[PDB]
Symmetry: C3
Subunit: 243 residues, 3 copies
Amino acid sequence: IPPIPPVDFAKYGEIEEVPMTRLMQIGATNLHRSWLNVPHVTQFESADITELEAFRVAQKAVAKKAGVKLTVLPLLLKACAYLLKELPDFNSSLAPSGQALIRKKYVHIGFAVDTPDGLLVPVIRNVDQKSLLQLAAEAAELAEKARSKKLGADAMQGACFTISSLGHIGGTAFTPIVNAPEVAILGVSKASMQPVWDGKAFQPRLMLPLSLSYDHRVINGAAAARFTKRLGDLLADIRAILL
Amino acid sequence: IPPIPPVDFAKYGEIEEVPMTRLMQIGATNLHRSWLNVPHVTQFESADITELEAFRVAQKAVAKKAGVKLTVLPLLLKACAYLLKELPDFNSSLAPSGQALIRKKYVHIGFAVDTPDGLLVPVIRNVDQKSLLQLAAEAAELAEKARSKKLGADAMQGACFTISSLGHIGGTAFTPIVNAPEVAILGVSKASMQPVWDGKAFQPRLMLPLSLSYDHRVINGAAAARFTKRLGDLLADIRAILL
Amino acid sequence: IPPIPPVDFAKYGEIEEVPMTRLMQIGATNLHRSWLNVPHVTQFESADITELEAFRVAQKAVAKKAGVKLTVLPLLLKACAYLLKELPDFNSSLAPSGQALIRKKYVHIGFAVDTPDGLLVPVIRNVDQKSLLQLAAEAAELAEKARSKKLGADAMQGACFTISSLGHIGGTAFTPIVNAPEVAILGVSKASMQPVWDGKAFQPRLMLPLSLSYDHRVINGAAAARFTKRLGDLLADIRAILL
Ligand SMILES: CC(C)(COP(=O)(O)OP(=O)(O)OC[C@H]1O[C@@H](n2cnc3c(N)ncnc32)[C@H](O)[C@@H]1OP(=O)(O)O)[C@@H](O)C(=O)NCCC(=O)NCCS
Ligand SMILES: CC(C)(COP(=O)(O)OP(=O)(O)OC[C@H]1O[C@@H](n2cnc3c(N)ncnc32)[C@H](O)[C@@H]1OP(=O)(O)O)[C@@H](O)C(=O)NCCC(=O)NCCS
Ligand SMILES: CC(C)(COP(=O)(O)OP(=O)(O)OC[C@H]1O[C@@H](n2cnc3c(N)ncnc32)[C@H](O)[C@@H]1OP(=O)(O)O)[C@@H](O)C(=O)NCCC(=O)NCCS
Ligand SMILES: NC(=O)CCCC[C@@H](S)CCS
Ligand SMILES: NC(=O)CCCC[C@@H](S)CCS
Ligand SMILES: NC(=O)CCCC[C@@H](S)CCS
């Protein structure tokens, strides 16, 4: 690939060199390797989380009594786990022959924690088997270890799918990069109150923005529009996971 | 381009290998070849199709009497054909010297059909010359042959532009990949009722989401914002094609 | 990278070759070099510019008396300059070792002018030091020289960041390509009146669409969501630049 020509930047004013951490350098190499290997598409969708949110908020005491804080991440993790089993092509990886998919029968999901040294993506194993307060506790443990440089490489391995949430900061949508060899990543941005047509008038509904990027060699446009459709439906009534 | 390191996926749980069809493998190679050759941009726009939709729906009897079903695809095909003639850089391909564009004086348009064996993109020739019920019938014939593995390579050749519609499944927008050597592709997602400011108050208007990806070597940001602007204007009053 | 197979396009109808200007050819080579070097993400945000717009419009006489026209570009340039100093990683470039960032202590910003011969990106130096009417005048001078082929390469050098505005034509958002070796570019699309929840009811607010693409090796998802968040906050009350 052609390199970028170097520029004498000091010709235009004062410059200062600061170095990158090794974590950043690893980060950079992996993103660029994903970028060039994966033909990326992003499918955008909005989910109605008005009731999910009122559930989250009422279980605040139960959560506090358990010493965990119930955020949105466990509710996303649980729904994505159910879905990674309903639609197994999203839970798989392209075999190195390029002629086979390796379907995984396990669901482990990573989540992006941006730390000062750089990006870490801790993995929660068997997300399909744990409960909202278990996932709540573990997510928080893993993120604290990640921030404290005390996360062991053991916990950064063999994820199936990644959730990347920037909802705590802002934004409307973004296009995340697939964390190859995984085949998809869900970006989540900030929920807003929004007018939604009910057949007669517009009703304010709390809308969550989802941005699914996927590896188009393995997932086609319709499979991906179906994944964000189902996910928006599960987040609108999470009781459907019960059936 | 660096390869992705292979991972022993069975270290994390049970895995199963399923193989890809040859169609998928062709599909995969072409997308990756497009990805690396085309610097992609996507221009998003919403068109007001409230009246186009009420037209579509009233001509339901005429269409049924003709044995065709009038969906939105022919109305998109007709408008894009008019536009591919108004703005000819969208109807062209980069010459292999990289120093010339080959402008095509014919308008043939492909459309994405996702089939079980993989993605096929049948082509309707001289879209500028056929009528809404002719395009309606042909589109449906071609898609059935595509699903039935009875489409001949003859009908997969020499398109100018591609329409990719996921509106029948869901979603808000996506970023399609240019089907090189073509120079643009229109993605169409799901229409929603939306409040639109009329100068005084908001009016519910049925809005269609368009996502134009283009080859930025050949099309610049302003030409592309002008294409989705014109297309949104033609879909708001399709009678302007008459003049 | 595999090449695209050549197609005999004349097999499907009449074709015509028109050649590309040298400007286009330069343009094309740079975009493709950026595409393959930069793992791109785009962060989308909407800023409430209702009051900024009413300011712009009232200062129309002051501006006319000064012989300049006050558009939105100077208000974006000033706010981005303040921000490029608050969040210095956006004002930097990846060193050729790939192990250092070169932080620039100067703020010069380019802006995309699409001209008939192709794309030019004139640079306004020390944007942090000039005032809204100075930036208004200079922006317009530079764009006229650009259109007139009288811009000297001197003025196309050593920018830190690029603004690309298509708001004058239309669109909802797009994904611009980073002008490497810079690390980010702000795309601006068309402002619309929009219902915005105020805690009780929806209020029409004039919303401006921003699309920040960035070099993910150097900028992480959270730094970028923070940049568009701050920028939306500064454009909502530009007096905060005063403090
Ligand atoms: C469990 C944990 C790992 C993730 O939590 P989370 O789901 O991000 O939620 P947080 O509590 O961090 O978010 C902060 C606030 O923004 C809110 N927020 C989160 N997602 C939001 C969304 N998508 N839309 C709008 N607001 C959101 C939270 O509910 C929370 O509100 P509060 O302060 O009133 O409780 C958490 O302990 C943590 O470490 N948080 C830090 C932020 C982070 O790195 N998140 C990464 C998730 S991929
Ligand atoms: C002509 C043909 C090829 C394409 O049809 P189409 O324009 O996709 O429309 P369909 O009838 O398939 O769509 C199914 C339903 O979703 C609706 N729909 C389609 N586009 C929509 C949009 N953009 N927004 C919202 N709803 C939409 C349709 O109008 C239709 O409604 P109905 O069931 O009440 O009639 C059709 O015969 C076919 O094979 N359809 C299958 C779907 C498909 O592969 N489409 C590919 C188009 S690129
Ligand atoms: C200063 C200059 C360089 C840029 O101006 P600008 O900020 O683009 O504004 P313009 O005056 O060109 O825009 C044309 C009209 O669309 C409006 N417009 C601009 N940005 C808009 C936005 N983001 N949303 C909605 N409308 C917008 C303008 O305010 C203007 O309205 P008017 O005709 O009623 O005055 C200008 O002199 C120029 O050369 N303009 C030509 C367009 C151009 O190339 N702009 C490139 C900016 S990166
Ligand atoms: N884990 C890594 O070392 C590479 C970076 C992660 C890939 C995704 S999270 C990028 C999101 S935009
Ligand atoms: N026709 C092919 O064999 C390649 C795949 C099509 C390119 C476009 S439709 C991708 C849309 S996201
Ligand atoms: N300046 C150049 O010669 C290359 C093209 C500019 C890069 C950006 S503005 C592309 C915006 S989508």
